[PDB]
Each structure stands twice: as C-alpha cells, then as structure tokens.
From Swiss-Prot:
PROSITE patterns: HBGF_FGF (PS00247). Its main location: secreted. This is Fibroblast growth factor 1. Changing R112E: Reduced integrin-binding. Defective in integrin-, heparin- and FGFR1-binding, and defective in inducing FGF1 signaling, cell proliferation and cell migration. GO terms for molecular function: fibroblast growth factor receptor binding; growth factor activity; heparin binding; integrin binding; S100 protein binding. The gene is FGF1. Predominantly expressed in kidney and brain. Detected at much lower levels in heart and skeletal muscle. Changing K105E: Reduced integrin-binding. Defective in integrin-, heparin- and FGFR1-binding, and defective in inducing FGF1 signaling, cell proliferation and cell migration. Heparin binds at N11. The keyword Secreted applies. GO terms for cellular component: cell cortex; cytoplasm; cytosol; extracellular matrix; extracellular region; extracellular space; nucleoplasm; nucleus. It comes from Homo sapiens. Monomer. Homodimer. Interacts with FGFR1, FGFR2, FGFR3 and FGFR4. Affinity between fibroblast growth factors (FGFs) and their receptors is increased by heparan sulfate glycosaminoglycans that function as coreceptors. Found in a complex with FGFBP1, FGF1 and FGF2. Interacts with FGFBP1. Part of a Cu(2+)-dependent multiprotein aggregate containing FGF1, S100A13 and SYT1. Interacts with SYT1. Interacts with S100A13. Interacts with LRRC59. Interacts with CSNKA, CSNKB and FIBP. While binding with LRRC59, CSNKA and FIBP seem mutually exclusive, CSNKB and FIBP may cooperatively interact with FGF1. Residues 105-121 are annotated as: Heparin-binding.
C-alpha cells in the first residue's frame, strides 16, 4: 500500500518539494518528493498524506495552506478523488463543510484560501497511481 508517491501539478514544470517551514513548491525527482511521499493507510476515499518516511508531516492550514511541518493532527487527513483521466481532486476530509480545492504554484505560495475554482490548477493534480484503493 505504501510506495514513493509524488504530487505533480500540471501548471508548468515539476512539483514535488516541501520545506520544513511548511511550504510545498516545484522540484524534479524520480517520483520522490522531498525524500519519500506516502499516501495510504485509510479507507476508500479518505487518505493520509505523509511527506518523507520520518521527518515531515503533510498538514492542512485552518485558513487555507498546505505544509509539512511535523505536527500530528486531524488536519493531515485528506480526501483523494482520482477521475482516472490523468487527474485527481483533493479536499479537506475533516473539513468537509469547507471542501475547498487545494493547488499551489511553482512560486511555492499555494492557493487554497484566496479562491479555488478557476484555473486547472484547482482541479488538475497528477500524483502516483499508488493509493489505498
Ligand atoms: O487570485 P490569486 O490568489 O492571485 O490566484 C490566481 C488564480 O489561480 P487560482 O484561482 O487557480 O488559485 C489564477 O487562475 P485563473 O482565475 O486566472 O483561472 C491564476 O492564473 P493561471 O490560470 O494562469 O495560473 C493566477 O496565476 P498567475 O498569476 O501565474 O497568472 C493565480 O495567481 P498566483 O499564481 O499568484 O496565485
């Protein structure tokens, strides 16, 4: 169930890097994000996103941001929606009431709180097929 996963965003370039400070940006590697991205160990739909075997912790921001600063919390539970056609959607599982689509930019400054809807960046994430089906 666990394998070197990555979160590629079809927005010009390669995306798969996370800074301890709590920020994700562009980068190129062999399906390995910062070291090893793990997305699995949950029920159908709900997924646990782990960045780096031991060190980083992918967590969502209450306002609208995605960080990997090691901080165990429900905010780490996300919903993975793969539509097969080389694209998937992610939403804050715990915050179903505010299912705001994620999506960052090569600059690093993600865009979830500003206004997610317009632009394929909001709905055009291509990760690794490895998931807890
Ligand atoms: O209003 P913002 O917070 O500054 O975000 C916008 C917005 O991106 P999202 O609404 O998907 O978050 C634009 O999308 P559109 O509404 O125009 O479809 C996008 O334009 P692109 O579709 O070309 O990415 C633009 O990016 P850019 O400034 O490179 O044109 C980006 O601004 P930021 O990249 O600064 O977040």
């Amino acid at each position: 169930y666990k394998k070197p996963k990555l979160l590629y965003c079809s927005n010009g370039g390669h995306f798969l890097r996370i800074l301890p400070d709590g920020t994700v940006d562009g980068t190129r590697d062999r399906s390995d994000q910062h070291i090893q991205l793990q997305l699995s160990a949950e029920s159908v739909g709900e997924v646990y996103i782990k960045s780096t075997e031991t060190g980083q912790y992918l967590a969502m921001d209450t306002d609208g941001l995605l960080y990997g600063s090691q901080t165990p919390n429900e905010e780490c539970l996300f919903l993975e929606r793969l539509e097969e056609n080389h694209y998937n959607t992610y939403i804050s599982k715990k915050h179903a009431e505010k299912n705001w689509f994620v999506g960052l930019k090569k600059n690093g400054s993600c865009k979830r709180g500003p206004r997610t809807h317009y632009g394929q960046k909001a709905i055009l994430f291509l990760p690794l097929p490895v998931s807890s089906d």
